[PDB]
Structure formats: C-alpha cells, structure tokens
Ligand binder design. Structure first.
Ligand SMILES: [Zn+2]
Ligand SMILES: [Zn+2]
Length: 91
C-alpha cells in the first residue's frame, strides 16, 4: 500500500468476521485480524494464527504485557479513510 494512497474497503475488512478492521492486530506472520476476533479466536482459544496456524502464545504475552497488540500505524490509516464504518462498529 503506497503512501497516502486510498486503501480498498476490502483490504480494510477483517478476514475472519468480514466487518471493518477495528483495532487491527497484526501477528508476527503478518496476517491481520480485528481485536474482537483476536480476543475470541486467538487470545482465549488457539494461540494460533487463524490464517496460517503460526503459534503465537509467546507473542501474545509479550505484547499484552506492554499494551502493544494493536498495529497503531494501520489503525490510523483505516480510521482516516473509513471513519464512518469505524463509528458504526463502535455503535
Ligand atoms: Zn474481525
Ligand atoms: Zn498467520
């Protein structure tokens, strides 16, 4: 994704639930999913990436402790180009 370029809506949708990516969590494999999905599908379930099966339990501990699970740079980009979609999910 080029700089200041407009991302497709599709590139901004969580691949698990199809909703807009709210507070996206990018795993060390570089697959991304929304925090809600992360919290249900990974943090309290598999500790796998749901796309590729990468073990992620130690990764989770590390960033949990440091409040750095969220990919702040991608979150910023999603809020900028799809603000309305983000507020609708918050609601
Ligand atoms: Zn999701
Ligand atoms: Zn993965």
């Amino acid at each position: 994704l080029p700089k200041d370029a407009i991302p497709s809506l599709s590139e901004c949708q969580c691949g698990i639930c199809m909703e807009i990516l709210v507070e996206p969590v990018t795993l060390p494999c570089n697959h991304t999913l929304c925090k809600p999905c992360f919290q249900s599908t990974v943090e309290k379930a598999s500790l796998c990436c749901p796309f590729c099966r990468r073990r992620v339990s130690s990764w989770t501990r590390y960033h949990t402790r440091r409040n750095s699970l969220v990919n702040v740079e991608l979150w910023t980009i999603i809020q900028k180009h799809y603000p309305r979609e983000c507020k609708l999910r918050a609601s």
